[PDB]
Amino acid sequence: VQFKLVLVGDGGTGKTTFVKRHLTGEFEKKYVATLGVEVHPLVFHTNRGPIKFNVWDTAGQEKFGGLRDGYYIQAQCAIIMFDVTSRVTYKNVPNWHRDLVRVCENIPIVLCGNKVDIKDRKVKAKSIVFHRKKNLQYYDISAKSNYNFEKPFLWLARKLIGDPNLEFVAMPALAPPEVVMDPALAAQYEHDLEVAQTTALPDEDDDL
Template sequence: MDTPTFKIAVIGNGGAGKTTFVKQAAAGAEGTYLTNLGALVTPVHLSTNMGELVFNCWDTAGQEKFGGLRDGFYVQTMGVIYMFDVTSLASYQALPEWHEDVERNTEDVPAVVIGNKADAQGRAVPADELTFHLDHELPYYELSAQDGTNLAEPFLSLAQKLTGRSDLALAP
């Protein structure tokens, strides 16, 4: 049986920690840089109680500034990870713009929101002011891509939605 594989767009402002997150979650897997799309594609494997799943994570790899060129990035996207840096109010305030990109280029794909750098000093986005995920009814996770805290949970949430299996769980 083939391993279920999903294309996931990991999006957010530069400096939010997307590349570190994907590299940490991939546990050393090598990514492939697609120069024509300005994306780094890295496979993240998730072991579940129903077998292995693979998320091909498409990271804009610093190409956020090219705006309209991102549209090709979303072709066949099956899920989205919105990421912001909890120490950067601007990265949080940009989430609606990223959401507009997703809405314009995909058809109702599952998504999660990640507040990265939860281990850092100088939080700029107070937890009680986080409303983007509530407004869009999306799961929210705080994590530290740097130290590897809480990396699997966003993927598990996406896996449950993509497979339609709410009983899907991480393998022991």
């Protein structure tokens, strides 16, 4: 029970950061451009059992495009990403949609406007209407603040399983094992702890 998800959009819009957040919980601040595609399994636990997405995180930069629409073959769902602080990334949404639906003629598609955490928003909510005639779901999202970060997968899960009432549920929490630290590794661990203590935590002004 797995579904191929292809994720497309202009370079720098946050596609890889969004997927990483879902994979590990981390927020990567650096922009390392994706080269061609990166494929990652992503599992969600629902009241209908687990759902597995095979996420094809593609490159948005043209010089790193790789196989381009060749990545879309046999996709069963998709996310189109743009950046609400960059008008040009919304202007290019119709181009990504065109190339996508020529290969994937009838799949559920979510349109995501990312980076809504940034104060100086440039693509205003009222300007965002492209999804209407194309039957795309739309969400404001932020991979940084996690605003609506789960909604795209929740909506896609409901469409792919065919159950409008599907919900994410708490994965079972097994009993953790008992500790027996090795006295040999005690010197190595106090070393790594000293480095970690003296490396400042990031974003110390966040509410958490």
